[PDB]
Symmetry: D2
Subunit: 121 residues, 4 copies
Amino acid sequence: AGITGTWYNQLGSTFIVTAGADGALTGTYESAVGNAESRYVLTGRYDSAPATDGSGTALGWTVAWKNNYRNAHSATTWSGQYVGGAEARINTQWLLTSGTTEANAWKSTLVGHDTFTKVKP
Amino acid sequence: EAGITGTWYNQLGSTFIVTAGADGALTGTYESAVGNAESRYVLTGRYDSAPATDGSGTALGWTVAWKNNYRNAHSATTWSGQYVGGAEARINTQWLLTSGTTEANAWKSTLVGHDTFTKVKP
Amino acid sequence: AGITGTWYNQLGSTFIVTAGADGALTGTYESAVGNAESRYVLTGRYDSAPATDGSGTALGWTVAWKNNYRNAHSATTWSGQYVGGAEARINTQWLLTSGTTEANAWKSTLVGHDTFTKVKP
Amino acid sequence: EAGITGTWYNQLGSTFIVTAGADGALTGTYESAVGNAESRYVLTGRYDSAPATDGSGTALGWTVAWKNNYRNAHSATTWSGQYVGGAEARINTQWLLTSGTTEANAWKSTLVGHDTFTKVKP
Ligand SMILES: O=C(O)CCCC[C@@H]1SC[C@@H]2NC(=O)N[C@@H]21
Ligand SMILES: O=C(O)CCCC[C@@H]1SC[C@@H]2NC(=O)N[C@@H]21
Ligand SMILES: O=C(O)CCCC[C@@H]1SC[C@@H]2NC(=O)N[C@@H]21
Ligand SMILES: O=C(O)CCCC[C@@H]1SC[C@@H]2NC(=O)N[C@@H]21
């Protein structure tokens, strides 16, 4: 029924988001893995007038991994598309950059892929 | 956050105007020199508002959806990277640009690259 | 029973490979999608003495998309790990670079992810 | 392929020694300036042996598994990119470095980055 809602990825992380009418994404993210506890703020953007040819809806969002419990000195961005229908899905690739010194910048950024559905594990 | 807040440019000639809020928010506008883009687009992101002080960069990211009130490319870019302060301040990034596609074309939906932003004295 | 064998990904592409004793990967790749027809040469490397703690076996390979039928002026590399067991798997991320002019180099490289099993679709 | 064949260096100070064969093969050795690496490692890859002549680069890629007869990091890097010829020849790449991990740690198995190689007059 749209991007707004509660989503879960293959790791069991929880992505709670609101899609504003003109393209904003606002919500919270809780990771099942990594140097993370509880909810973190997220903000992003999506295409609020997608094509009408069967294409997905492009979108992205960011989490900086600082909250009242922990600070991992890192940030993840997810870039992907929403695919509607009977089992809606958000398919993403992500980049997780840690703050590093300049000599260690070559090893600053992890890459991966997450797929989200509204099915609670 | 005075470091991040300001006007920046990348190696393509694109314009990144940003404000860093006390709460970790990034807000501003982006103008790409290339691609299916014209004029300014809204951006929004997050940064580490209490970064290490041990000679590490400050982790940050932001998103642009490539729709404005003049054009719509049906696509979105996210930049993930770090701010390196000082007199020659830089934001070093890698990015992912996803286009909306049909399911059959989803394998070719996402471009990857890297941008380096230089801050400009206001 | 090891890396050597015939593998298929989620697109239905066919990856036929031999793992040499000292780390070579040699074989052919046939893509189900894109500017591709029939088999293409591949070469790569793998860790020929993996850890003994339950970790996967790191590996990578390259295809340049030129054969006797077509030339797409492009190359893909896959980087990932082999995971043995009852349903062995190779989990990868890939980079597909097309030859471009310098002004268009920003849009030269696609990224994605392929998972391979020995199950024939 | 005289263009690609030779000795190259990247911005980290690493050494890439390669031979480009008539059949599209790349063979050689790689020496990283950084990471869990010492001495030379075998590489192997492929390139477009009949590239466009319209002012485009030549697509190529290669792999190093980080095991040699002195060290084993249980990891592998692939570089994907293009050769740009002429008097100031470059190979511009992006790379993926996958470490062997347990299944629980697989989400953090892969680093991404970018290297630019400069050819050195033999
Ligand atoms: O360890 C850190 O630096 C903070 C937590 C990172 C968790 C990552 S973000 C990408 C991937 N998807 C998830 O749901 N969790 C991991
Ligand atoms: O073509 C599109 O879909 C929209 C414009 C994309 C421009 C990209 S975003 C990554 C890179 N950095 C820039 O400043 N511009 C390009
Ligand atoms: O279109 C091209 O330039 C050549 C074919 C590319 C096919 C790509 S490689 C990554 C992905 N995995 C596949 O099995 N096929 C596509
Ligand atoms: O630490 C490891 O697992 C092995 C060494 C990895 C070195 C990486 S490969 C990408 C980048 N470019 C280089 O020349 N060195 C680093």
